[PDB]
Amino acid sequence: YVFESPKMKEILEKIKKISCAECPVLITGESGVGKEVVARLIHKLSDRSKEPFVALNVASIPRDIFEAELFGYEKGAFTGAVSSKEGFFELADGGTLFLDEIGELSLEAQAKLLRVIESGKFYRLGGRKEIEVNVRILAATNRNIKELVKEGKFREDLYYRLGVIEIEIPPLRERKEDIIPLANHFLKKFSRKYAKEVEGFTKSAQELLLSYPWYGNVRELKNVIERAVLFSEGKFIDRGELSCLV
Amino acid sequence: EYVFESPKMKEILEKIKKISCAECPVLITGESGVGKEVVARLIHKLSDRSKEPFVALNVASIPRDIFEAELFGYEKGAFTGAVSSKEGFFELADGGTLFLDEIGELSLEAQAKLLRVIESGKFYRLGGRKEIEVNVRILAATNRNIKELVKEGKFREDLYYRLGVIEIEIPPLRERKEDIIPLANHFLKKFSRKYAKEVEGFTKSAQELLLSYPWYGNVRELKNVIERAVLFSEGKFIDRGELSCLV
Amino acid sequence: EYVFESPKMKEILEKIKKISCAECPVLITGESGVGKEVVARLIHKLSDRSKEPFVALNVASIPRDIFEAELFGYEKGAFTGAVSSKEGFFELADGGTLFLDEIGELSLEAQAKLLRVIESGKFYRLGGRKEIEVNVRILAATNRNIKELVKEGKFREDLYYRLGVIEIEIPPLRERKEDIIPLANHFLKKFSRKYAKEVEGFTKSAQELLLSYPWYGNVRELKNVIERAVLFSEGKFIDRGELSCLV
Amino acid sequence: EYVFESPKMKEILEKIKKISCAECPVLITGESGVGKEVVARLIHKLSDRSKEPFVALNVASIPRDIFEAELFGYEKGAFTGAVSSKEGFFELADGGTLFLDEIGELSLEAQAKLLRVIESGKFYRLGGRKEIEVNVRILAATNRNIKELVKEGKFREDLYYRLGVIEIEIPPLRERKEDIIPLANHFLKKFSRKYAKEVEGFTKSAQELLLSYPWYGNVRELKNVIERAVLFSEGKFIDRGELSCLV
Amino acid sequence: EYVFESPKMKEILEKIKKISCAECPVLITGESGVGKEVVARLIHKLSDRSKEPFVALNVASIPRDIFEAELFGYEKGAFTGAVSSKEGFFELADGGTLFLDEIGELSLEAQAKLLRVIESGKFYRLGGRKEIEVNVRILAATNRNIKELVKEGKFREDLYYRLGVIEIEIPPLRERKEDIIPLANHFLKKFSRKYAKEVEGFTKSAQELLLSYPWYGNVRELKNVIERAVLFSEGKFIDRGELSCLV
Amino acid sequence: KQGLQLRLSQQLAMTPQLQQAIRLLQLSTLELQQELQQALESNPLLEQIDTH
Amino acid sequence: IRSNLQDAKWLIKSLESRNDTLLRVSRCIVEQQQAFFEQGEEYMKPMVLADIA
Numbered sequence A: 001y002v003f004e005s006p007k008m009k010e011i012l013e014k015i016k017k018i019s020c021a022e023c024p025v026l027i028t029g030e031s032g033v034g035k036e037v038v039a040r041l042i043h044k045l046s047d048r049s050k051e052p053f054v055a056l057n058v059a060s061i062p063r064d065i066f067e068a069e070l071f072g073y074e075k076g077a078f079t080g081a082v083s084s085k086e087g088f089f090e091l092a093d094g095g096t097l098f099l100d101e102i103g104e105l106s107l108e109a110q111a112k113l114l115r116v117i118e119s120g121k122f123y124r125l126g127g128r129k130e131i132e133v134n135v136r137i138l139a140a141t142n143r144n145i146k147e148l149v150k151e152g153k154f155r156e157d158l159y160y161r162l163g164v165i166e167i168e169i170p171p172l173r174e175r176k177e178d179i180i181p182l183a184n185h186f187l188k189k190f191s192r193k194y195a196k197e198v199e200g201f202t203k204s205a206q207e208l209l210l211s212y213p214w215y216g217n218v219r220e221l222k223n224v225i226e227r228a229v230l231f232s233e234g235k236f237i238d239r240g241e242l243s244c245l246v
Numbered sequence B, C, D, E: 001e002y003v004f005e006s007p008k009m010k011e012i013l014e015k016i017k018k019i020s021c022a023e024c025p026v027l028i029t030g031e032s033g034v035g036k037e038v039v040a041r042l043i044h045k046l047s048d049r050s051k052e053p054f055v056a057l058n059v060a061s062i063p064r065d066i067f068e069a070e071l072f073g074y075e076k077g078a079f080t081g082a083v084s085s086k087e088g089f090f091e092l093a094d095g096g097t098l099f100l101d102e103i104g105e106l107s108l109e110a111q112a113k114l115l116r117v118i119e120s121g122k123f124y125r126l127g128g129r130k131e132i133e134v135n136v137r138i139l140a141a142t143n144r145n146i147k148e149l150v151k152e153g154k155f156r157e158d159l160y161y162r163l164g165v166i167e168i169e170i171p172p173l174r175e176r177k178e179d180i181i182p183l184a185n186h187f188l189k190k191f192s193r194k195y196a197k198e199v200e201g202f203t204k205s206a207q208e209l210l211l212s213y214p215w216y217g218n219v220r221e222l223k224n225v226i227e228r229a230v231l232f233s234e235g236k237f238i239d240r241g242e243l244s245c246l247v
Numbered sequence F: 001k002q003g004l005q006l007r008l009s010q011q012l013a014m015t016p017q018l019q020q021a022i023r024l025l026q027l028s029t030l031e032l033q034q035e036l037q038q039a040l041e042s043n044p045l046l047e048q049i050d051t052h
Numbered sequence G: 001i002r003s004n005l006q007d008a009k010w011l012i013k014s015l016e017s018r019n020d021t022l023l024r025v026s027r028c029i030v031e032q033q034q035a036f037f038e039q040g041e042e043y044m045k046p047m048v049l050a051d052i053a
């Protein structure tokens, strides 16, 4: 990974300092800024470096089977319970659990989440033995959680538990010092990956990168660079190729 | 170790001592974070079943469609996907105590399934043709006023008269002024010894700030605040400024 | 033979020429009957592996309960009734192309299972111990709005990002008006020899009528209309009245 | 054997005779009792494959979870219980005609499984790794407005254009006023001979009553009315009174 | 055995005798407790199938997931757990009559599975590729009003015309005033011997009371009332006092 | 979702095949003889070679 | 009589298999620890169940 902006350097120093503590960590920012990158950096420098890093997104979780993913189930608990399954809390036993897009969780299921965090013990669906696990919680959000709380769309206890230490990542629109390093890194990486000689962007094309108000941020930048490399026919990338996408 | 300093808590403890010779169901009521489960565990410990299982079950988390399977079990060919017999929580807690947390949140349809087992103690499995008799003592805890729910047609009256043989009401921490400082000291000691920080006690300003706050999360909120203060302390005494998590 | 006589279609053809020798999964999106199958088979034909199998599959025709058994394979004795070991479709298209039609019908668990293999490139049989490495080029076609699917919470976002590296969006036939006339004359001949009916071409009024209809089935609807016109006619020219009832 | 006196049915008969040499799928639409089955069987008889099987499937009676096994078959060992290989209804109807009756009662999930077989005729069995090609003509019948279902988000827009190559609409009996009397005599000769009665015709008032009645069950209701009139008849004629109590 | 005295009830018996030679489906309608099953069994007894099976089926107690497996049967290997071939109720009732009780309780989707078997009698078993033809007479009984149910939209129109070839409606007991006293005496004679009582008849006031009560349960309620009167009787006559429940 | 239903499905089921005739290995000679005596009592067609 | 005869034959086969297994295991154990039977203790070799298995 590449970090050059002063804000990114400050965030890196903060991540270095907070890796020792085991308190839950919340990260917020716009889409495609690198929240998962920061979470993985925290996990790597933490005392649980060799432990599993279980990352999951709650947006793709169906409403009516959330418990089956929260606790897991044993064999034959219900129709379709072919074999035993482990919930994400049991998967990350000793490791770190990373919940992405926590702000879109339904109100009813939220009350069912922190209840397992504070107690620390749960029963598998169809299981008659009690399971005790220890997990470090990292959470990611895209919107403002405080405004959601003021609208009654979020639990304040869950915010207090998750918001022990919270981090804000500046979007790429205000990190213009990373545009050229990220573009060059992606260019070299994808040029090696697809095995075709592309040296670097022309001077004319460089100003287009700054002039572009990136809305998809790093994800959009990476996709654009990869597509430009795929269609590239020379070692120098001109502004004409980039202008087709933007 | 638990803290019972207020006269009301001592009276509750004396009532538990007196009822330690009974096997009646118990109903516990209060706010959230006041210590209902602590009182339930104390009742279990002081009774004659202290060496027997204590099964704590949150009836507000079990899916509605598999309620009977969890509570009563099933046999090999009960449904599509059943491969072997499995016991329920009533049979697991045979000879011991079953604690039902948040009984008020149980839906009005689910309250009908528990009617016969509480009194008779006998039931059938899902797909079983033999009657099972168990000896289980029922402790139930709720935060909502059951009487109002019954009066407004939300909680069944049969279940209310089955459960509420003995009722215990736990006053909130807001009305237990004498029971704040000892709990704060206990939590401070525990967190200092656990997190391996350095702290010995609070300052007078900190004591007044703790005593003036209207704790609405009760002992839960107090424990969380003390834990955060210990995590954000490096000296020896916690001042008023550090304990700014309150208002 | 196919017809590509529109500037957007010619640009798409140039993109196909540029991309056909790459090694990245391709996603083909468009309306109904635009030519996604044509584009997929043209990508495979103009490729260094054009002599290798082109396994076309419909993801809605595979039951969930045996899904991972069909896609990866199973060993003998993996489950009750497993007479003998069998390979999966991933091994069947080893060294060739795997085309998945209507990728939007996949379930979340199937999406995760496919994502694992697309990322790592290696998998295991249902009851196997050794690890299998494959060299499959993955093409997937769909007509749904994939962005709305991921926003609603039906398609995994990481899987879409993995597949959606290259997007080929075939424009609707209503935006390809200069391509309508060469297509119709292409079909009119093909059916004329097929059904032995004698017909030469369309009159000016019929040609004017063709360009004005907002086709909803795109090329397939035009093919159906031309087939009906050829079947229900005997003269050498198709006029306005013959197509008026159809339109 | 049938009655086609009305000109609106003579035009349909001409259209049926016009598509004898074709093999494209046909979609038949109408109300209840208008004669979709008769039209389908007449189309099959008048074609070049009249010596081949005519497989009629009520698609609403196929269970949801075994839909793929019925329409495609399976190899042995495909699942727990596949002790021998089987052929689906597409392989059984090879070389002949497959008639999907009441296709409008098909679930949205089961409509996506027929998208590739109807187009090309190539498919895999459940557990088979070799493609199977069949030559089957497809006739489909429905009593619902298929366009309204397509525009109401109940019927897929790809399956409609795959099936609806040639569409035949049968007008109700309220518009075929020239068939009511030729049919009424027809069924009469069918029933008075079956039950060995002595009825030979209708009076001049019963014919007017038959003409005036707005038949809502169409030819099936006409059959029922004529059968009831014959069963409870006495004499050589059926007067107005013998059926005025009904229609 | 059964008692038919009211003039409007003898016409039903004459109609039953009129349709002895017929084999068309019969639809029976009436209120609760008027004797629909009595009429159905009388129709079966007076027909040419009187020595053949009479399969009485409650279509409201068949699970919807295995419905197709109960009426049609299945072959070996159709699904997981099908270890042998099993027939259905249509083949079990072959040569006799099938009596669908409470046909109006079927769901809209469950009514579409009976369309092609009521008319032609041909069907395929689950997992069977050979067609089966049966000879079964369909009797159906319902206490609702099928015409207005079809008008509302809770009953399929294409099934009503298949079932309702001959419709028989039974009037309520409050309109069969000539049947109240004979039925009362028949039930009194039936119950005075089972319980070995000494009652022989009613009083004039009791008979006057029996004629004014608007029987809501019809013959079943009358039978229950007479049984209650017999059980708690002391003398040889039942007085108006013993029938106080009818006031 | 989570539910208890009766249905017709096509599934791949697992294969348990043991615990049969395994408890006789760990039994000593005396316990084995007692088990054989019980089996002889319960089965008419089983006999033991007699010395009388 | 058929059911009882089948059960009897199964039990006889089980006993025979048990005896054969015991004999094989004993023979393997004696072959592995052979310096003990000639010179007593102090010549025992270390072994676990995995070796015999």
Ligand SMILES: Nc1ncnc2c1ncn2[C@@H]1O[C@H](COP(=O)(O)OP(=O)(O)OP(=O)(O)O)[C@@H](O)[C@H]1O
Residues within 6 Å of the ligand: A001, A002, A003, A030, A031, A032, A033, A034, A035, A036, A037, A038, A100, A101, A140, A218, A219, A222
């Ligand atoms: N400093 C960096 N250097 C290189 N690549 C980076 C950097 N930061 C982010 N990326 C790339 O950005 C892409 C998106 O990162 P990530 O998924 O963490 O962001 P996000 O969309 O904001 O997060 P999330 O969806 O998990 O909330 C990744 O492919 C990652 O490699």
Ligand SMILES: Nc1ncnc2c1ncn2[C@@H]1O[C@H](COP(=O)(O)OP(=O)(O)OP(=O)(O)O)[C@@H](O)[C@H]1O
Residues within 6 Å of the ligand: C001, C002, C003, C004, C030, C031, C032, C033, C034, C035, C036, C037, C038, C039, C142, C143, C186, C219, C220, D158
């Ligand atoms: N350029 C072309 N020239 C001739 N025929 C064409 C051309 N493009 C498409 N077609 C015809 O269009 C028909 C439908 O196209 P195709 O099979 O690609 O559908 P599709 O886009 O995959 O449809 P769906 O989205 O409904 O699954 C085919 O029969 C094909 O022959």
Ligand SMILES: Nc1ncnc2c1ncn2[C@@H]1O[C@H](COP(=O)(O)OP(=O)(O)OP(=O)(O)O)[C@@H](O)[C@H]1O
Residues within 6 Å of the ligand: D001, D002, D003, D004, D031, D032, D033, D034, D035, D036, D037, D038, D101, D102, D141, D219, D220, E115
């Ligand atoms: N022209 C005709 N001459 C004689 N009988 C006819 C004619 N048209 C229809 N019928 C009769 O109409 C009756 C009603 O069944 P029909 O074949 O019309 O089915 P349908 O309502 O069109 O649809 P489906 O049977 O596919 O559900 C049949 O018994 C058939 O004999």
Ligand SMILES: Nc1ncnc2c1ncn2[C@@H]1O[C@H](COP(=O)(O)OP(=O)(O)OP(=O)(O)O)[C@@H](O)[C@H]1O
Residues within 6 Å of the ligand: E001, E002, E003, E004, E030, E031, E032, E033, E034, E035, E036, E037, E038, E039, E101, E102, E141, E219, E220
């Ligand atoms: N004419 C009669 N003579 C004697 N008993 C009669 C007569 N009519 C009805 N019954 C009695 O009435 C009782 C109830 O009638 P029955 O069950 O036939 O009607 P039903 O409620 O319409 O039927 P179902 O609901 O079962 O379709 C029976 O026990 C029957 O013996």
Ligand SMILES: Nc1ncnc2c1ncn2[C@@H]1O[C@H](COP(=O)(O)OP(=O)(O)O)[C@@H](O)[C@H]1O
Residues within 6 Å of the ligand: B001, B002, B003, B004, B031, B032, B033, B034, B035, B036, B037, B038, B039, B219, B220, B223
């Ligand atoms: N008297 C007490 N002494 C020590 N700890 C207490 C006391 N009362 C409550 N607590 C603490 O408060 C927490 C919440 O109490 P508990 O009874 O478990 O839940 P609730 O009362 O909300 O159902 C517990 O973890 C318990 O340790």
Ligand SMILES: [Mg+2]
Residues within 6 Å of the ligand: C036, C037, C101, C102
């Ligand atoms: Mg397609």
